[PDB]
Amino acid sequence: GKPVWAPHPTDGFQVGNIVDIGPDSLTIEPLNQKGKTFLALINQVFPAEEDSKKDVEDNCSLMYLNEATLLHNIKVRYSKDRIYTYVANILIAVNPYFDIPKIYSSETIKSYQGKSLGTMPPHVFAIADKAFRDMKVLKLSQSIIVSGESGAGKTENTKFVLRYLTESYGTGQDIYDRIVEANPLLEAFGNAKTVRNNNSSRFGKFVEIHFNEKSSVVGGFVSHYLLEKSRICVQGKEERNYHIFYRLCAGASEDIRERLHLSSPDNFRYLNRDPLLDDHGDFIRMCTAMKKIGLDDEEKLDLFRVVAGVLHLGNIDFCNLKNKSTQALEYCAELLGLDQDDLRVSLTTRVMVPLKVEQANNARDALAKTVYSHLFDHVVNRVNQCFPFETSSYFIGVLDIAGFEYFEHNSFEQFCINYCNEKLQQFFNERILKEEQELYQKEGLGVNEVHYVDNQDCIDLIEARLVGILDILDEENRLPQPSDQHFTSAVHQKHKDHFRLSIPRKSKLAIHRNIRDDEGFIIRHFAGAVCYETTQFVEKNNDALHMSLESLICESRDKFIRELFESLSFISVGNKFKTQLNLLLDKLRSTGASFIRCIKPNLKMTSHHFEGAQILSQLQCSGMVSVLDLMQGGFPSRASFHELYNMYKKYMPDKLARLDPRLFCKALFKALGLNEIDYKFGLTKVFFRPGKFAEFDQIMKSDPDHLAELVKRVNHWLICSRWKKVQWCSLSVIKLKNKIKYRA
Amino acid sequence: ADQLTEEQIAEFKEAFSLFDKDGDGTITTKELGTVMRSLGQNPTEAELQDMINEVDADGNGTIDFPEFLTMMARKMKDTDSEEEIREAFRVFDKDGNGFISAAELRHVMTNLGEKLTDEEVDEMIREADIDGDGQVNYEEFVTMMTSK
Ligand SMILES: Nc1ncnc2c1ncn2[C@@H]1O[C@H](COP(=O)(O)OP(=O)(O)O)[C@@H](O)[C@H]1O
Ligand code: BEF
Ligand SMILES: [Ca+2]
Ligand SMILES: [Ca+2]
Ligand SMILES: [Ca+2]
Ligand SMILES: [Ca+2]
Ligand SMILES: [Mg+2]
């Protein structure tokens, strides 16, 4: 029969032929290898495009829209360096891992100004332009939600959005520049080299451009989420700490690195555990951005001191301080304006009493993290002071936060990020459903029985008051002897019967069954089961610095160090985030929203290396297949009269090929007798039910003589349409010139 | 509109694609003027602007078919309806002799961007030519205009 798509363990899908049908599954013969066979579930085998070399800008133009034809379409585009593709209004963006010529040029930006989605090739610029036009025209704030795994290109596509807006709609407005020049500053304190991304955002962000009633930019605002605290002290084999550390160590003036007792990064514990990373140049680029948003030389110094302060704090070794450390402690207590005694005292002794080596270490790091984290808070807030405002009418908000992705070991940090993406995914489901309903109503397509099933029960499991996991966790932190194991049992007992919760030992995967019931749980997230190791959940849920250490630093010699802290010692990390996340949804839910799905093509940061299975998984995890299923319920195939005309005029009599696209298609419907059930002649496009586009395509490709015949039978009607078109147009022009009179 | 029948609205929808050449369902003043000029009119930009401001509910400066429908609407004395058809005909019958000739149809079609051959223009004439004299008169023009 016809080649079909069937599963393939590394390509995601492969071409093969169905050689045998079973009740549960189909026997496939891979294309190349006659004699080879394998089984696939019936719902895992998909029809393919006849033309395996074509590519379309909108996947709705495919004859068969499904995960396999989608994967293959973006694959062909990506091979030709076209990294952007639409699924209706959604932008899919595949990281190219190199700089593609022309695509982001100032000229190319101009070519997108004012244009509707579809009138230009798919592009992040088109999404940016649409947010601005919907704002200005609809008088409604706008959000652009950029998601994907680490390394997928969220941060880059976020910059492209800000660049496009600044150059298109902010020519004389410097506020735009301060907003663009902000991210270089944030990235210094919040980004870091990981094994997944050399410039990984270690925090989530929402960037709001604020406007007055005349679409003029009046200010900006930046929200930041979930800074990665643990990276402040220890980092993985092949990773680094936050950029700013290495940037200041490799860019500081001879003077400064002398006043701050700075050496090469190898001299600090916090940096100990760099070919493609221009720390030196990036330092320069940072200082530029600081002057550009209005940091004085004094602030620049204040930040640096603390960064340096934190560095030396990490050198203090332990008991009490060795001698290697008494020079460290001296530097540290000087940069943080502390009494070298109280500090050493505070690092070595606790009130409840002496401290072992371990306990002195935790207390040193705990203080380090708290100082750095507040520093970062101060920085982000400083940025918001570069474009404040007491009032505004609208905003355009760009969300840049890490999606769901796979980790060998899922701890609390993944638990927070996956919690977040459950709520974003819900929002996304709700929004795609509304757009589809709106379209079906505007074009008279009827109803769609298909509905994404809600994940509210999953969200509730995590966040509900008193019984949600986050509150159960908070109780634990407040108990006399908090324990990760007691926490985990509480969750299991409370939700024994929960659809979304499971015990690790029920897993099909042996490595999970190895985990005792009170050491983890499996949550059935939107994207799939995630097994959480709850060890350390209790400690990680706590942002609070011990009273002794906090006092030490609160009452400090330096005013800037004291101002960082103008704020049982327990501050819940989970619940703080919940509140932030809920504030963020309040904002998104008040906007019209667009979606950019960023896809990381492989794990090696290389170009032109499409890993099909890795990419298929991201499409699934990011809800895209959910969208394809919704579309299958109605009219998943959508083509403009223009697109159809170019595709099929060649099969029709020259007389027909001479009509305009709209009238051409209108004639085809009439000559073919197309059933109003399967085919919808819309306002500007033809809408086809599943299979019906492929069927229409066969009709156009059938016997040319018979086709000419059908057209001929409708000739009188066609000629009459043509008369009426021009006749009524004439009456139109006349009614219009009579209206011009009527108004004077 | 609500003063127009289903049939009437259908015909204007088709007429509208003549302004909306790109087929996105919206026109600007640019496309309003171009078509009007093609049919022997000549509004000033100021005149278009004023007219389009009535129905352009948003500020976009572009309109769509139902906004168009209302932009054509106005108060009309009985005489006005027929006066208008009578005058559309005279857009075709450029020499006023009461008959639209093939050369004349050809003039209007090509002016409107319609592509067709000379033979096809003759065909158009022939099909409207009820009495068989080889040209199109008023009654025949009206008949064709109002026929499904
Ligand atoms: N559109 C693009 N063009 C060129 N390079 C890109 C593009 N998108 C991503 N990159 C490269 O990929 C890297 C990671 O992208 P990034 O936006 O940091 O991912 P994320 O924010 O999703 O973790 C960037 O440092 C850049 O090198
Ligand atoms: F790592 Be990326 F910033 F998500
Ligand atoms: Ca148009
Ligand atoms: Ca309008
Ligand atoms: Ca004449
Ligand atoms: Ca006649
Ligand atoms: Mg990022």
The 3 state secondary structure assigned to A363-392 is: HHHHHHHHHHHHHHHHHHHHHHCCCCCCCC
CA of A154 to the centre of ligand 2 (A): 7
Task: Assign 3-state DSSP to chain A and report helix, strand, coil percentages, each to 5.
Answer: 50, 15, 35
CA of A688 to the centre of ligand 5 (A): 45
How far is C-alpha A697 from the chain's CA centre?
Answer: 37
Q: Which two tokens stand for residue A306?
A: 């603390």
Protein residues near ligand 6, an ion, with CB under 5 A: B 129, 131, 133
Query: A398 with A161: CB under 8 angstroms?
Result: yes
Is it true that A240-291 and A702-744 share their CATH fold? no
CA distance A731 to chain B (A): 6
- Tell me which of B60, B78, B96 is where a domain ends: B78
Say which of A66, A191, A200, A542 is annotated catalytic: A200
- B69/B112 same-domain check: no
- B9/B71 same-domain check: yes
- Annotated ligand binding at B82? The verdict is no
- Annotated ligand binding at B104? The verdict is yes
Report which of A192, A370, A197 is spatially closest to residue A271, judged by C-alpha positions: A192
Say which of A151, A190, A251, A397 is annotated catalytic: A151
Q: In A336-449, where does DSSP find H-type helix?
A: 340-348, 357-384, 412-443
Q: Which two tokens stand for residue B10?
A: 């259908």
User: Residues in chain A whose beta carbon is closer than 8 A to a beta carbon of chain B?
Assistant: 116, 119, 133, 136-138, 640-642, 655, 658-663, 683-684, 716, 719-740, 742-743
- B84/B142 same-domain check: yes
Chain B positions touching A725 (Cβ under 8 A) are 14-15, 17-18
Say which of A59, A66, A155, A421 is annotated catalytic: A155
- B70/B83 same-domain check: no
Report which of A238, A251, A239 is spatially closest to residue A191, judged by C-alpha positions: A239
- B66/B17 same-domain check: yes
**Minimal-distance CA residue to ligand 2 atom 4:** A150
For the question of residue A201 being annotated catalytic, the response is yes
Instruction: Quote the DSSP letter at residue A115.
Output: P
CA distance A686 to chain B (A): 12
Angle formed at CA A30 by CA A28 and CA A36, multiple of 5 degrees: 80
Q: 3-state secondary structure string, A183-216?
A: HHHHHHHHEECCCCCCCEECCEEEEEEEECCCCC
Nearest CB neighbour to B14, from listed A719, A728, A734: A728
Say which of A59, A197, A241, A617 is annotated catalytic: A197
Q: Exposed e or buried b for every residue in A129-156, given b needs 16+ CB within 10 A? A: bbbbbbbbeeeebbbbbbbbbbbbbbbb
CA of A150 to the centre of ligand 2 (A): 4
Nearest CB neighbour to A727, from listed B16, B22, B145: B145
Query: A493 with A482: CB under 8 angstroms?
Result: no
- The 3-state DSSP class for residue A679 equals strand
For the question of residue A151 being annotated catalytic, the response is yes
Q: Using alpha carbons only, how large is chain A's radius of gyration in Å?
A: 30
- B61/B99 same-domain check: no
Query: A143 with A591: CB under 8 angstroms?
Result: yes
Written as one letter, the residue type at B31 is E
Inter-chain contacts counted by CB atoms under 8 A, chains A and B: 135
> Tokens 């099933």, residue?
A453
Decide if B91 and A730 are in contact by the 8 Å CB cutoff.
yes
Nearest CB neighbour to B39, from listed A136, A662, A730: A730
CA distance B132 to chain A (A): 16
Residue of B nearest to A137 (CA): B58
Written as one letter, the residue type at A439 is L
Does domain A407-543+570-591 fall into CATH 2.102.10.10? no
Decide if B51 and A739 are in contact by the 8 Å CB cutoff.
yes
Nearest CB neighbour to B114, from listed A116, A642, A726: A726
- The 3-state DSSP class for residue A542 equals strand
Query: B26 with B64: CB under 8 angstroms?
Result: yes
Decide if A734 and B87 are in contact by the 8 Å CB cutoff.
yes
Query: In chain B, how many H helices and how many E strands?
Result: 8, 2
> What DSSP element (H or E) covers A88?
none
Decide if A684 and B25 are in contact by the 8 Å CB cutoff.
yes
- What's the resolution in A? 2.6
- B69/B89 same-domain check: no
**What is the CATH number that goes with domain A702-744?**
6.10.250.2980
Q: 3-state secondary structure string, A581-605?
A: HHHHHHHHCCCEEEEEEEECCCCCC
- B11/B44 same-domain check: yes
Question: How is chain A split into domains, by residue range?
Answer: 1-54, 55-239+390-406+592-634, 240-291, 292-389+544-569, 407-543+570-591, 635-701, 702-744
Name all residues whose Cβ lies below 6 A of ligand 1.
A 95-97, 99, 148, 150-156, 197-201, 598
Chain A positions touching B39 (Cβ under 8 A) are 729-730, 733-734
For the question of residue A197 being annotated catalytic, the response is yes
- Annotated ligand binding at B129? The verdict is yes
Q: Which CATH code, of 3.30.70.1590, 3.40.1590.10, 3.40.50.150, 3.30.70.20, is assigned to A635-701?
A: 3.30.70.1590
Query: A209 with A163: CB under 8 angstroms?
Result: no
CA distance A679 to A686: 7
CA distance B12 to chain A (A): 6
Query: A633 with A689: CB under 8 angstroms?
Result: no
CA distance A487 to A542: 14
Query: A355 with A362: CB under 8 angstroms?
Result: no
For the question of residue A411 being annotated catalytic, the response is no
**Chain A interface mutation, best of B12, B60, B72, B94, highest count of A Cβ atoms under 10 Å:** B72
- Tell me which of B31, B63, B78 is where a domain ends: B78
Q: Which of A108, A146, A199 to mutate to test the pocket of ligand 1 (most atoms within 8 A of CB)?
A: A199
Q: Which two tokens stand for residue A217?
A: 């930019």
Assigned architecture for domain A240-291: Orthogonal Bundle (1.10)
CA distance A728 to chain B (A): 6
**Sheet containing A4-8: which strands, arranged edge to edge?**
A38-41, A25-30, A12-21, A4-8, A46-47
Report which of A627, A439, A438, A621 is spatially closest to residue A59, judged by C-alpha positions: A627
- The 3-state DSSP class for residue A7 equals strand
Residue A337 region by backbone torsions, left for phi larger than 0, else alpha for psi between -120 and 50, else beta: left
How many domains does chain B fold into? 2
Q: Which two tokens stand for residue A701?
A: 């490709």
Q: In A224-321, where does DSSP find H-type helix?
A: 243-249, 256-259, 269-272, 279-293, 297-313
For the question of residue A405 being annotated catalytic, the response is yes
Domain extent for B13: 5-78
Query: A169 with A135: CB under 8 angstroms?
Result: no
CA distance A714 to A701: 19
CA of A644 to the centre of ligand 2 (A): 40
Q: Exposed e or buried b for every residue in B19-55, given b needs 16+ CB within 10 A? A: bbeebbbbbbbebbbebbebbeeebeeebbeebbeeb
CB-CB neighbours of A499 under 10 Å: 10
Cα distances (angstroms) measured from residue A393 to each of A123, A190, A293, A337: 28, 30, 24, 44
Decide if B11 and A728 are in contact by the 8 Å CB cutoff.
yes
Residue of B nearest to A132 (CA): B60
- B12/B72 same-domain check: yes
Q: Which of A82, A85, A95 to mutate to test the pocket of ligand 1 (most atoms within 8 A of CB)?
A: A95
Report which of A618, A286, A688, B90 is spatially closest to residue A610, judged by C-alpha positions: A618
CA distance A344 to A332: 10
By the 10 Å C-beta count (0-12 exposed, 13-18 middle, 19+ buried), A278 is classed as: middle
**What is the CATH number that goes with domain A292-389+544-569?**
1.20.120.720
- The 3-state DSSP class for residue A281 equals helix
- Tell me which of B45, B78, B111 is where a domain ends: B78
CA distance B88 to A672: 33
HSE-up of residue A650 (Cα within 13 Å, Cβ side): 5
Nearest CB neighbour to A732, from listed B15, B75, B109: B15
Residue of A nearest to B123 (CA): A719
Nearest CB neighbour to A733, from listed B25, B35, B92: B35
- B104/B90 same-domain check: yes
Written as one letter, the residue type at A53 is K
> What DSSP element (H or E) covers B20?
none
- B26/B36 same-domain check: yes
Query: A397 with A143: CB under 8 angstroms?
Result: yes
Name all residues whose Cβ lies below 6 A of ligand 2.
A 150-151, 154-155, 197, 200-201, 402
CA distance A702 to chain B (A): 26
**What are the backbone angles phi and psi of residue A97, rounded to the nearest 5°?**
60, 25
Query: A150 with A402: CB under 8 angstroms?
Result: yes
For the question of residue A150 being annotated catalytic, the response is yes
- B92/B33 same-domain check: no
Assigned architecture for domain A1-54: Roll (2.30)
Question: What method did the depositors use to determine the structure?
Answer: X-ray
Assigned architecture for domain A55-239+390-406+592-634: 3-Layer(aba) Sandwich (3.40)
CA distance A122 to A616: 20
